[PDB]
RNA sequence: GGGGCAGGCUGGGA
RNA sequence: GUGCCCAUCACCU
RNA sequence: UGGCUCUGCCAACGCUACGGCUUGGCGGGCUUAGGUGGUCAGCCGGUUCUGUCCUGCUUCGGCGAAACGGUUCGGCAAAACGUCGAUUACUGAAAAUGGAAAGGCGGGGCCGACUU
């Protein structure tokens, strides 16, 4: 690599890449009407999708916009398998040329960096540097505030390919605020978009002990006043540059726990979020009072992995006291 | 009978393509081959019976055969022992079967629309 | 691009075949492992394994519940073949895990088929 | 009739079976399928002569049409054309004769 | 009754099956199809007797007629002679015996 | 009655080793015997589902066809004859499945 | 007493 | 609905 | 894949239209992704019961205060990578799906220690 990137729709529409996109788009969706209707003539559908992309005639199918309401109401707009496949074809060539420039401390929707690598970086970067305080911010409606215009000043500072730029502008028109949450193209662009505040933490502001997961941003420090100044500088930027309002923020001392990514993260210990605990508790309970106690063991083994890192035992005892079943 | 003669002629291109693939399937995958050949060559009889009658159920059984032929492409692509249909051959065959499915779809609509 | 649309698009048939292709993807390699002898049993097992797809597919493209029970009988016959390849075949054909594993995959296809039969019966 | 149709289809087999036997080893499986369509169509005619319901009379017609496809396949799709277009002309006239009896047979049963 | 025809048709098999095996591999499909029509017509009789539908006895009659076709076809099937006209003559006598029992069976049902 | 299949699985367990032995010589008869032996499960399975005496008479006809195969494979000659012991000690296994099938058919006929 | 953390215990949104 | 990370299941290098 | 409508040999159940066929040997030729979960972006509360801490500085406004993951420890940060420089220079009418760099900032990366 060396900047530019001016021939991407050739790679986006390569059959070897669209097959990867097809595989990625189908991964886990192989029981859905989208895949099963597509899987019928999959390589023929991939041929008319390749020749729709490579020809410049791909039009993104309409988002079917439901509102999932689970943690909080989110207007989650789903896409057709053909459209989720094109997004996967884009975010196979376009994602690793954005995710390459994302400072290493961004842990969202990136290979090898995740929900856990973040909670380990916050907590690790809490142990080293011996942070006394921390700034945790969060962007109001992040996806429904991404400007989709200043974003296409970052997606157009790295794509340079007049055709990929147009495929990205059929997936995500470069108009007004509102990146559809519930799209692969969107997690990247949101991570890319949120990556602007990363560079204002790490490049400007010279903050080296921080972590961003999409819209959540932890900034460990040493003065609860320098971290407050960093936030004010971060908030003023993300507002006047990116149009992202800060919903919640806190410059707390490292003592109040860094509520980062389903783990309240102290330097020493790291519990879980009570919401995740209670959600799993009630989910096991609903599953109980619905009639499933054998798939629960599959879930429990699963959630025992998400909770093996946290110093839990504040659920497994509880659930052993409610039903008697041997968890661990 | 225009659609039956058309659907067979267009399905002949599927056979013309898939039969050489079906003949190349190593004996190891012999049952899969003989069943693929009976599904490939036997889809003609599904089209013939569909044209010989007017029941849209016979044109749906022709669609089931075409769907079964598309399974065979998926299956013979999947088998890794010896080996059969290369992914390019599934691609090209699915294109041919799609034109057979296209004519069958218009055929089904013609019957459903009296 | 609007994916190529077959006529009579039955999800239950598309889902049951995609899930039964996992049974094939598992059983076909160990169907092919059944030695030279036991080849008739393998041919018949393979025509029951690979031929069950056609049973599901014809059941989908049909407004006849009769095709859906024939698909259930074939899945029941495939479950026998697991018992046969394990507990009647001489070398072994199918190890009890491979049996236990396949019986899980066939149960997934059986769960879809039972819901499919129930949805049409109503 | 019921043996009149087979006696004429015997001539189709008597003609096509030597051709089917000429199909090389490479296309042995297609030959086996062609032979089970050629030789097996007698049973389609025979089973229609016994139980005179029109159901197997159309199945016999579908088999004859499938045998006509095999003529197209053996000399059109079988890449080493295992049948010559002349053979696809006299065999089609042999199948057309047994098709004429089958057509009159269909009409006689579906007359009343 | 199914037991009488099968016992009498077992004589057709006992005669034709060695003959059917002697059909050259060259005529292998015709052989394997003749053998599946020889053995396999038992099942037609058995299904006709282990049940009752008259269609099954027509299916048994159709199989017997298909077996008679095979004798006529295998007789002068090609240069690789399958069945001698006497073997056809001898088998046709045994199949006529089972044809007579089938005909009386069909008559007694009707 | 799916004790039928479990009891017939012993007929297969007995009559399958003697079929994986029928040589290539009697290959058609073997392929047909194995399709009659192993395919009888399908007849019982389709009868357990259908609970129709038609699909039970088909299962009875298959057992009768399996009894024919014993009587045919006995008189097949050479070292590859199903030994007369085996024909007897498989008609015993088939009779076990035949008695359960007879009680089956009677249970359905006499509802 | 006020606060911080944690465990609960429940309303909604589910 | 989206991905990241993780757990298990399948499966041979 | 218990093949071969495939041959040579020799047999012998057998069948022969007497040629052979069949059949048996016997040579030979032909024959990493995945599934299912779960996370997390991705709640708002309310309430005390609790367990345990904390309750100071003061400018007088407010700020406060509550046994390891290789999450390791040093050494480096040249290079590569990232990013800004830059879709700039530069070539060329035009950057046109060419295209730098000097540098600047990083730690992602690197080096060892120890452990994995």
Nearest Cα neighbor of D24 from E79, B32, E26 is: E26
Rounded-to-integer distance, Cα B76 and Cα B86, Å: 8
Residue A75, CB-side half-sphere exposure with 13 Å CA sphere:
11
* Three-state SS annotation for chain E: CHHHHHHHHHHHHHHHHHHHHHCCHHHHHHHHHHHHHHCCHHHHHHHHHCCCCCHHHHHHHHHHHHHHHHHHHHCCCCCCCCCCHHHHHHHHHHHHHHHHHHHHHHHHHC
Cβ neighbours of F62 in E, within 8 Å: 43
Token pair for B9: 């002629």
Distances (CA, A) of B69 to A191, A281, B50, D98: 43, 47, 17, 31
The DSSP output letter for E77 is S
Determine the topology of domain E2-109 in CATH.
de novo design (two linked rop proteins) (1.20.1440)
Question: Between D35, D47, D49, which is nearest E59 by CB?
Answer: D47
The DSSP output letter for A60 is P
Cβ–Cβ below 8 Å for B19 and D61 = no
Determine the topology of domain D4-109 in CATH.
de novo design (two linked rop proteins) (1.20.1440)
Q: Which is it for the CA torsion C59, C69, C52, D68, positive or negative?
A: negative
A15 touches strand G (CB under 7 A): no
Cβ–Cβ below 8 Å for A38 and C3 = yes
Beta strands in D1-112 (DSSP E): none
Nearest Cα neighbor of A142 from A105, A96, A191 is: A191
As a whole number of Å, the end-to-end CA separation of chain E is 14
Cβ–Cβ below 8 Å for D21 and E27 = yes
As a whole number of Å, the end-to-end CA separation of chain A is 49
Q: Is B110 on the interface with C (CB under 8 A)?
A: no
Mutate which of D5, D21, D60 to disrupt the E interface (most E C-beta within 10 Å)? Answer: D21
The DSSP output letter for B108 is H
The DSSP output letter for A223 is -
Q: Which residue has the tokens 């092919």?
A: C32
Residues 6+ apart with CB under 8 A from C62: B57, B60, B61, B64, C68
Cβ–Cβ below 8 Å for C88 and F13 = yes
The minimum CA-CA distance between C43 and chain B, rounded to whole Å, is 6
The minimum CA-CA distance between F63 and chain E, rounded to whole Å, is 9
The minimum CA-CA distance between C3 and chain F, rounded to whole Å, is 37
How far from the centroid of its chain's Cα atoms is residue B34's Cα? 14
Cβ–Cβ below 8 Å for B70 and A40 = yes
Beta strands in A112-165 (DSSP E): 133-139
Chains touching C (at least 3 CB pairs under 8 A) are: A, B, F
| Structure determination technique employed | cryo-EM
Nearest Cα neighbor of F59 from F7, F18, F20, F111 is: F7
Domain F3-109: state its class.
mainly alpha
Is residue A22, in this structure, part of any structural domain at all?
yes
Distance A253 CA to I50 C1' (A): 25
Nearest Cα neighbor of A14 from A57, A49, A38, A56 is: A49
Residues 6+ apart with CB under 8 A from D108: none
- The resolution, in Å, is 3.2
| Phi, psi values for residue A64, rounded to 5° | -85, 105
Distance A172 CA to H5 C1' (A): 26
Cβ neighbours of E37 in D, within 8 Å: 43
| Closest CA in chain B for residue D26 | B23
| Phi, psi values for residue A5, rounded to 5° | 90, 55
Nucleotides of I under 7 A from a protein CB: 1-6, 13-17, 19-25, 30-31, 33-44, 63-69, 71-74, 81-88, 96-101, 104-108
Residue B86's CB is within 10 A of a number of other CB atoms, namely 12
Rounded-to-integer distance, Cα A82 and Cα A35, Å: 9
Q: What is the DSSP string of F59-76?
A: HHHHHHHHHHHHHHHHTT
Answer yes or no: is A316 a known binding residue: no
Rounded-to-integer distance, Cα A84 and Cα A22, Å: 9
Is residue A280, in this structure, part of any structural domain at all?
yes
Domain ranges of chain E: 2-109
Distances (CA, A) of C9 to C62, C69, C75, C116: 10, 19, 22, 14
A321 touches strand G (CB under 7 A): no
Rounded-to-integer distance, Cα A86 and Cα A12, Å: 9
Q: What is the DSSP string of D52-70?
A: --HHHHHHHHHHHHHHHHH
- A77's enclosing H/E stretch is strand A77-78
Cβ-count burial of C4 within 10 angstroms (0-12 exposed, 13-18 middle, 19+ buried)? Answer: buried
Pairing of strands A133-139, A210-213: unpaired
Residue B38's CB is within 10 A of a number of other CB atoms, namely 18
C97 touches strand H (CB under 7 A): yes
Rounded-to-integer distance, Cα F111 and Cα C13, Å: 35
The answer to whether A105 and A218 are in contact (CB under 8 A) is: no
Radius of gyration of chain E (CA): 14
The answer to whether A286 and A278 are in contact (CB under 8 A) is: no
Residue F42's CB is within 10 A of a number of other CB atoms, namely 19
Answer yes or no: is A142 a known binding residue: yes
Rounded-to-integer distance, Cα A214 and Cα A139, Å: 9
Q: Which nucleotide is nearest to C37 (CA to C1')?
A: I2
Cβ–Cβ below 8 Å for C3 and A31 = no
Determine the topology of domain B2-112 in CATH.
de novo design (two linked rop proteins) (1.20.1440)
Token pair for E39: 């053995």
The minimum CA-CA distance between D22 and chain E, rounded to whole Å, is 10
Q: Which nucleotide is nearest to A68 (CA to C1')?
A: H1
A302 touches strand H (CB under 7 A): yes
Q: Which is it for the CA torsion C105, C107, C113, C118, positive or negative?
A: negative
The answer to whether E56 and E47 are in contact (CB under 8 A) is: yes
Token pair for A299: 């879930």
Distances (CA, A) of F48 to A295, E42, F54: 30, 25, 11
| Closest CA in chain B for residue D30 | B37
Cβ–Cβ below 8 Å for F68 and E51 = no
Give the dihedral of Cα atoms B76, B79, B83, B85; nearest 10 deg.
20
A212 touches strand H (CB under 7 A): no
Residues 6+ apart with CB under 8 A from C7: B59, B60, B63, B101, B104, B105, B108, C61
Provide the CATH number for the domain formed by C11-121 in this structure.
Answer: 1.20.1440.60
Cβ–Cβ below 8 Å for F57 and E51 = yes
Radius of gyration of chain B (CA): 14
Long-range contacts made by residues A300-309, C-beta under 8 angstroms, separation at least 24?
A: A300/A327, A304/A328, A306/A262, A306/A276, A307/A272, A309/A116, A309/A119, A309/A263, A309/A270
| Closest CA in chain C for residue F47 | C73
Cβ–Cβ below 8 Å for E30 and D31 = no
Token pair for D31: 């030959």
Rounded-to-integer distance, Cα A186 and Cα A84, Å: 11
A11 touches strand H (CB under 7 A): no
**I2 C1': nearest CA residue:** C37
Question: Between C2, C4, C15, which is nearest A31 by CB?
Answer: C15
The helix/strand/coil state of C92 is: coil
Residue A303 sits at the vertex; the CA angle it makes with A300 and A305, to the nearest 5 degrees, is: 115
Helices F27-37, C39-49: axis angle to 10 degrees equals: 50
Q: Is F46 on the interface with C (CB under 8 A)?
A: yes
Cβ-count burial of E15 within 10 angstroms (0-12 exposed, 13-18 middle, 19+ buried)? Answer: middle
The answer to whether A131 and A209 are in contact (CB under 8 A) is: yes
Token pair for C96: 């009890």
Task: Starting at the earlier edge strand, list the strands of the sheet with A133-139.
Answer: A210-213, A216-221, A133-139, A246-253
Q: Is F25 on the interface with E (CB under 8 A)?
A: yes
The answer to whether B76 and B84 are in contact (CB under 8 A) is: yes
Rounded-to-integer distance, Cα A199 and Cα A205, Å: 9
Residue B26's CB is within 10 A of a number of other CB atoms, namely 13
Nearest Cα neighbor of B72 from A85, D32, B28, B64 is: B64
A183, A219: one domain: yes
A307, A256: one domain: no
- Give the count of domains, chain A: 2
């Amino acid at each position: 690599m060396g900047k530019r990137h001016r021939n991407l729709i050739d790679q986006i529409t390569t059959w070897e890449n669209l097959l990867d996109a097809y595989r990625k788009t189908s991964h886990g969706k192989r029981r859905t009407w989208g895949y099963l209707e597509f899987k019928e003539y999959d390589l023929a559908n991939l041929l008319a999708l390749q020749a729709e992309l490579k020809a410049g005639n791909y039009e993104r199918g309409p988002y079917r916009e439901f509102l999932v309401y689970e943690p909080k109401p989110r207007l989650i707009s789903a896409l057709e398998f053909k459209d989720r496949l094109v997004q996967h074809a884009l975010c196979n060539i376009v994602a690793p040329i954005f995710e390459a420039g994302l400072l290493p401390y961004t842990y969202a929707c990136r290979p090898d960096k995740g929900t856990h690598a973040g909670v380990c970086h916050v907590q690790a970067e809490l142990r080293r540097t011996r942070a006394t305080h921390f700034l945790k911010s969060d962007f109001s409606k992040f996806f429904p505030s991404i400007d989709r215009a200043a974003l296409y000043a970052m997606i157009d500072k790295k794509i340079h390919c007049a055709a990929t730029r147009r495929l990205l502008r059929v997936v995500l028109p470069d108009e007004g605020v509102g990146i559809p949450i519930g799209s692969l193209t969107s997690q990247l662009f949101a991570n890319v978009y949120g990556g602007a505040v990363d560079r204002l933490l790490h490049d400007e502001l010279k903050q080296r002990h921080w972590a961003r997961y999409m819209d959540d941003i932890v900034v460990l420090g040493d003065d609860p006043e320098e971290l407050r100044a960093v936030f004010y500088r971060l908030r003023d930027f993300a507002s006047e540059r990116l149009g992202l309002k800060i919903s919640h923020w806190q410059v707390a001392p490292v003592s109040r726990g860094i509520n980062f990514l389903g783990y309240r993260i102290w330097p020493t210990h790291k519990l879980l979020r009570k919401s995740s605990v209670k959600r799993a508790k009630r989910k096991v309970a609903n599953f109980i009072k619905h009639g499933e106690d054998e798939s629960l063991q599959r879930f429990l083994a699963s959630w025992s992995g998400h909770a093996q890192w946290a110093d839990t035992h504040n659920l497994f005892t509880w659930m052993e006291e409610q039903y008697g079943i041997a968890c661990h | 009978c225009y659609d039956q003669m058309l659907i067979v002629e267009r399905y002949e291109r599927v056979i013309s393509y898939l039969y050489p693939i079906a003949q190349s399937i190593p004996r190891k995958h012999g049952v899969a081959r003989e069943m693929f050949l009976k599904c490939l060559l036997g889809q003609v009889e599904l089209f013939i019976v569909a044209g010989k009658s007017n029941q849209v159920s016979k044109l749906y059984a022709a669609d089931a055969g075409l769907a079964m032929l598309r399974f065979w492409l998926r299956f013979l692509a999947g088998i890794q022992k010896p080996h059969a249909m290369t992914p390019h051959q599934v691609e090209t065959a699915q294109v041919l079967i799609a034109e057979v499915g296209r004519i069958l779809g218009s055929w089904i609509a013609r019957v459903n629309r009296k």
